[PDB]
């Protein structure tokens, strides 16, 4: 497999990239705004399978990792959880999140402006940790470590939801936005090494053949 | 297999890296200056095995690719060949070469300032094309293409000598200097797709075990 050295250059370029992304839903979708609705509907349905009732994740507290302006928080997390926390490295996106999450902003506990590879989630605090379209911005080493720290952040019966692009064959390192698109074997390998197991997984439907496939994973 | 997208950023970072690299032997060796002398010794022996003789590579013309200041030309190529041409992307290194090469510099036909992924070796002009510690600065796609153009630049019985770091297992992408450390299998695959055959193959001995292995290939 691939090892990335010079991680400083990797993360610095990503900040330069997102400094020019508009703080809008279209910006969060990399201009694929037409795919936001089918993304949200599949995420809502996937979350319902693992939350609520005995032995399943609670509905009290959720963490939105690489939240951007809070697209997932607004449409997926805030309708379900009593409190939601956003973490994102871009101050501009979190500033906009406060305006973007207007109707349900009273249930947003905190806006954490930190890079995930430097972030330690509080111990056993979250019922659900949502990681969508940001895991590709962490190196293998840093993603492995971040997933292990997220495991420690879960309450009993809590789960991590990982949603991202999954390459059909081999990994793609994209130097323009400092992202790595991983294939299924590499991804499952990092999930395993972090001490997590796949409770469930589902391929995103209604997405175009011209785009890399998208997958959802429930981890615990 | 791993793939690199956004080459523009890849090659650009490499130029920024080498703009801060001193035009000295120590700069060429990446602060492994003590390894230059064993490198020269192993290369001279390896070259003698494929040059001078019946059906062997001629001794008339050589091309030093990614020559830097001409460390390889000064100690390996210019003693053996009637004329040597250097090609490198940093004009500061080609300029310093005229000093560093000293008397051997009199046998340099031309200093070409080109990036290898944009360079086309003149057709059927060289008995030996030497490619040392630069192939890692080309993407798999650009390295394949460049090797094919090198093969077209060879005279009858001409050969390509490739010397570079080769990982024992798993590739390494170093974003600090924009280089890929390929491993043995993927490098052999790229050589094969280019239409080249391995004549000889030797591991560099005398290098510290803490270093990535270094290999020499004779190709035609």
């Amino acid at each position: 497999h691939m090892v990335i050295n010079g991680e400083m250059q990797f993360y610095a370029r990503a900040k330069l990239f997102y400094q020019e992304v508009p703080a809008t839903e279209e910006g969060m979708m990399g201009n694929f705004i037409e795919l936001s609705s089918p993304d949200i509907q599949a995420s809502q349905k996937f979350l319902r399978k693992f939350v609520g009732g005995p032995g399943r994740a609670g509905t009290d507290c959720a963490l939105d990792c690489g939240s951007g302006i809070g697209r997932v928080s607004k449409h997926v997390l805030l309708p379900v959880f009593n409190s939601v926390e956003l973490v994102d490295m871009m101050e501009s996106f979190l500033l906009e999140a406060q305006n973007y999450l207007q109707v349900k902003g009273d249930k947003v506990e905190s806006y954490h402006c930190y890079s995930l590879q430097e972030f330690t989630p509080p111990f056993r605090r979250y019922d659900v940790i949502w990681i969508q379209w940001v895991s590709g911005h962490l190196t293998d080493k840093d993603l492995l470590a971040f997933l292990s720290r997220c495991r420690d952040g879960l309450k009993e019966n809590g789960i991590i939801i990982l949603k991202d692009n999954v390459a059909r064959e081999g990994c793609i390192l994209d130097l323009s936005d400092s992202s790595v698109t991983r294939d299924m074997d590499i991804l499952r390998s990092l999930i395993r090494k972090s001490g997590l197991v796949v409770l469930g997984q589902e391929k995103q439907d209604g997405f175009p053949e011209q785009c890399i496939p998208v997958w959802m994973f429930a981890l615990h | 297999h791993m793939v690199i997208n956004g080459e523009m950023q890849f090659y650009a970072r490499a130029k920024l890296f080498y703009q801060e690299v001193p035009a000295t032997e120590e700069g060429m060796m990446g602060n492994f200056i003590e390894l230059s002398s064993p490198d020269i010794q192993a290369s001279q022996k390896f070259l003698r095995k494929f040059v001078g003789g019946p059906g062997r590579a001629g001794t008339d013309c050589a091309l030093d690719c990614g020559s830097g200041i001409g460390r390889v030309s000064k100690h390996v190529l210019l003693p053996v060949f009637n004329s040597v041409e250097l090609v490198d992307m940093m004009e500061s290194f080609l300029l310093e070469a005229q000093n560093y090469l000293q008397v051997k510099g009199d046998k340099v036909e031309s200093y070409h300032c080109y990036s290898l992924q944009e360079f086309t070796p003149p057709f059927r002009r060289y008995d030996v094309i030497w490619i040392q510690w630069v192939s890692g600065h080309l993407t798999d796609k650009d390295l394949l293409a460049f090797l094919s153009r090198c093969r077209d630049g060879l005279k009858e019985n001409g050969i390509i000598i490739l010397k570079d770091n080769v990982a024992r297992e798993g590739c390494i992408l170093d974003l600090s200097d924009s280089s890929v450390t390929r491993d043995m299998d993927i490098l052999r695959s790229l050589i094969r797709k280019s239409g080249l055959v391995v004549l000889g193959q030797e591991k560099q001995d005398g290098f510290p075990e803490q270093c990535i292995p270094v290999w020499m290939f004779a190709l035609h």
Binding site: M28, W133 | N5
Partner: peptide, 9 residues
């Protein structure tokens, strides 16, 4: 977010 698929040659 979503990305266009790459081609393999």
């Amino acid at each position: 977010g979503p990305k266009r698929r790459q081609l393999t040659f």
